[PDB]
């Protein structure tokens, strides 16, 4: 075998402790590049002029932040959607001031995380599995593309991408609600149903399987030793679990087919998170959540407030206060 | 393979309708997102200059120029948040541009009334609206029934391009598995992982 | 939800954060376990739609735990190898998260908020160039309180004249 | 930054006390027959 055939067999080898693969040859350098830069930026990056207004925001630990307030700050509003790699800057100090690390991290990250999806397909193919774990992963992946790339594109600036930090995440969320009324958008509402339902179904399935575990152990040992890795027998009585849960609700509400049950556990949070990602990605083009401000009018024409009107007051308070020195004209247009 | 291709094309159309004002003329599709934001800066430049303001020397609150500033490569551009949209090009704005960007002498002397009308029209028809078609920002009251075609066309085609990407992944994985012969599950007799050495 | 941001800074509360992790971690486990089972199924019948190949009276596992384990160990580094621990962990994660958030809300009953980080407030007060995402969020919170309180708490009879409302430039 | 003077010891013990508890139980498990 030539060197190329040996290299290809190494790359696609199922015997590697971590599977490399062809997606892995992209995923590995990109993710290492994004990780290393993130860690250094989060610890040590100087303040970044996120709003393009010479008002730099301190995001790193060395510059006064803790774990909760620290972030990699989005690139400058003056840059917009312009590609800002290291070589485009006159110096690293300028690249740092303008938020260069953010563009480097999210670009390597998104490329790397896309290849993580491909790598999940790839290994399932090498192992003889069915191929659709990667489809499930496309839900959080789409969500990451929504907040890091699609939202900035529709808004015209990587300065509107979600910051890489915890409080930065909250700032992104609050401003988003102010500007788009995300809570009143049915795609976000389906996202919530996806995640509450997903956690519900996670609890339900975990609890029903655990409740129906077949006795193989005594009281003095963990019941988890009742299962042996790679045993052929089922470790729980699915007929008992169906008999419980179909009496908890009613018989036809309960899955008796484990394959149907597990498909439902896949499909519910995945479809819900897809709607959440599409929510963000469509509010990127400013198709906003429902506006019922002043929808209820009395016989004279007096506005009768509803709960949506109270939401609007809160929305106004965030809107008038956010980026408090960046606006020069009456309408916040992008 | 077609689903992969259609998804890519869907994403490209979303960007075409959002940014391009040539094959999607603003007189039919409304202003682009960048176009309306630029139209606002222009509108208030015109109004304030008519009141007597020296627009090239007005400082904003941050110290950057309130109406005019420089892009990161020196071109004279509109100020405020619309600094992000300085690459916008439109037939109502290009007569104010010189070699160095927005020309301050043309701005003082050569804004026509048709440009003032166009800037005001575009600023008030920004592609921002609610799902029930209430125009403007989320904080706006009901009155204006407006969601720009560009918003409808971009949002729809992002949604479609995305699910078609999902479909590509679904069908590409399934066609691979079905050709290799494991799309219906692992054969219990020759399970491939059991013939492999353990990882540790 | 918006009241708890503006008045309690509830997103900053570590008990809420534990809740978020349990809810999102729960939905992740829901998605990943469902997808893992569906994609490591044994071929137990001839149909390409594979739901018919299950019978509730079977003793045998319907999917390959060994293949699932090998897949996840190579993709992510670690994997479940005990089905009982897997299913318990699925109970534990969303249940613990919701309990943690409940404890946070009990604190908020008494206004015992995690509203502020004292060290940043000392620094921001003395250094008008120090800005973080936490400081920006506090201004957002001040806007929420002032702009919403007169109509959200009409028993108080708040008259906040327009000149007292916090606003940034232009908007 | 002007931080709580007890935050370092509170964090160090919050780490070290249950970590050593788990290490003790792990190590004595491995040494069983």
């Amino acid at each position: 075998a030539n060197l190329w055939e040996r290299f290809c067999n190494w790359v696609t080898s199922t015997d590697n402790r971590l599977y490399v693969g062809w997606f892995g040859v992209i995923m590995i350098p990109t993710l290492l590049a994004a990780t290393i830069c993130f860690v250094i930026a989060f610890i040590a990056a100087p303040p970044v002029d996120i709003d393009g207004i010479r008002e730099p925001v301190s995001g790193s630990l060395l510059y006064g932040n803790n774990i909760i307030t620290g972030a990699v700050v989005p690139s400058s509003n003056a840059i917009g959607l312009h590609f800002y790699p290291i070589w485009e800057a006159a110096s690293l100090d300028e690249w740092l001031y303008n938020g260069g690390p953010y563009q480097l991290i999210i670009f390597h990250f998104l490329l790397g995380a896309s290849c993580y999806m491909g790598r999940q397909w790839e290994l399932s193919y090498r192992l003889g599995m069915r191929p659709w774990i990667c489809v499930a992963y496309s839900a959080p992946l789409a969500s990451a593309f929504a907040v890091f790339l699609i939202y900035p594109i529709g808004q015209g600036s990587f300065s509107d991408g979600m910051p890489l930090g915890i409080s930065g995440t909250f700032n992104f969320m609050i401003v988003f609600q102010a500007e788009h009324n995300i809570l009143m958008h049915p795609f976000h509402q389906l996202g919530v149903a996806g995640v509450f339902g997903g956690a519900l179904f996670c609890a339900m399935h975990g609890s029903l399987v655990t409740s129906s575990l077949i006795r193989e152990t005594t009281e003095t040992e963990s019941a988890n030793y009742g299962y042996k890795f790679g045993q052929e027998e089922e470790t729980y009585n699915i007929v008992a679990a169906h008999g419980y849960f179909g009496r908890l609700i009613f018989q036809y509400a309960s899955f008796n087919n484990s394959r149907s049950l597990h498909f439902f556990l896949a499909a519910w949070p995945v479809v819900g998170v897809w709607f959440a990602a599409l929510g963000i990605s469509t509010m990127a083009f400013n198709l906003n959540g429902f506006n019922f401000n002043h929808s209820v009018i009395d016989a004279k024409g007096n506005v009768i407030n509803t709960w949506a009107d109270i939401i609007n007051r809160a929305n106004l308070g965030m809107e008038v206060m956010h980026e408090r020195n960046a606006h020069n004209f009456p309408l916040d247009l992008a | 393979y077609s689903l992969g291709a259609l998804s890519m094309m869907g994403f490209i159309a979303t960007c075409f309708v959002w940014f391009n004002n040539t094959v999607y003329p603003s007189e039919f599709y409304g202003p682009t997102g960048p176009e309306a934001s630029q139209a606002q800066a222009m509108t208030f430049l015109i109004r304030d200059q008519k009141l007597g303001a020296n627009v090239g020397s007005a400082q904003g609150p941050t110290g950057l120029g309130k109406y005019l500033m420089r892009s990161p490569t020196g071109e004279i551009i509109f100020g405020g948040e619309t600094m992000r949209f300085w690459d916008f090009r439109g037939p109502w704005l290009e007569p104010l541009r010189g070699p160095n960007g927005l020309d301050l002498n043309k701005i003082k002397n050569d804004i026509q009334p048709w440009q003032e009308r166009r800037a005001a029209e575009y600023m008030t028809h920004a592609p921002l609206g609610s799902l029930n078609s209430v125009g403007g920002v989320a904080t706006e009251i009901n009155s204006v029934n407006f969601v720009s075609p560009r918003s409808w066309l971009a949002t729809s085609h992002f949604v479609l391009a995305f699910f078609f990407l999902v479909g590509h992944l679904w069908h590409a994985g399934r066609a691979r598995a079905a050709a290799a012969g494991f799309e219906k599950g692992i054969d219990r007799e020759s399970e491939p992982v059991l013939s492999m050495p353990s990882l540790d | 939800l918006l009241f708890f941001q503006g008045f309690h800074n509830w997103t900053l509360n570590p008990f809420h954060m534990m809740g978020v992790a349990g809810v999102l971690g729960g939905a992740l486990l829901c998605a990943i376990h469902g997808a893992t089972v569906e994609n490591t199924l044994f071929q137990d019948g001839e149909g390409a739609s594979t739901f018919r190949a299950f019978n509730p009276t079977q003793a045998e596992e319907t999917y390959s735990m060994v293949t699932a384990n090998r897949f996840w160990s190579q993709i992510f580094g670690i994997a479940f190898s005990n089905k009982r621990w897997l299913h318990f962990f699925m109970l534990f994660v969303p249940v613990t998260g919701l309990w943690m958030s409940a404890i946070g809300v009990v604190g908020l009953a008494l206004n015992l908020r995690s509203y502020d980080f004292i060290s940043q407030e000392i620094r921001a007060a003395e250094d008008p160039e120090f800005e973080t995402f936490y400081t920006k969020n506090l201004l957002l919170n001040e806007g929420i309180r002032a702009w919403m309180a007169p109509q959200d708490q009409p028993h108080e009879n708040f008259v906040f004249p327009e000149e007292v409302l916090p606003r940034g430039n232009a908007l | 930054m002007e931080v709580n003077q007890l935050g370092l010891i509170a964090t160090a013990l919050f780490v070290l006390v249950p970590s050593v508890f788990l290490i003790i139980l792990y190590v004595q498990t491995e040494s069983q027959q």
């Binding site: 630990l61 890795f229 | 353990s198 | 384990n69 | 931080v3």
Partner: peptide
């Protein structure tokens, strides 16, 4: 002290990842 503390805890987590991956109890088919 704060910055050192956060980085220390973070570095321990990364080390724990290393041991959890490369020095796990090996899954044994029985």
């Amino acid at each position: 002290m704060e910055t050192i503390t956060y980085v220390f805890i973070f570095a321990c987590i990364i080390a724990l990842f290393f041991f959890a991956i490369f020095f796990r109890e090996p899954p044994r088919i029985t």
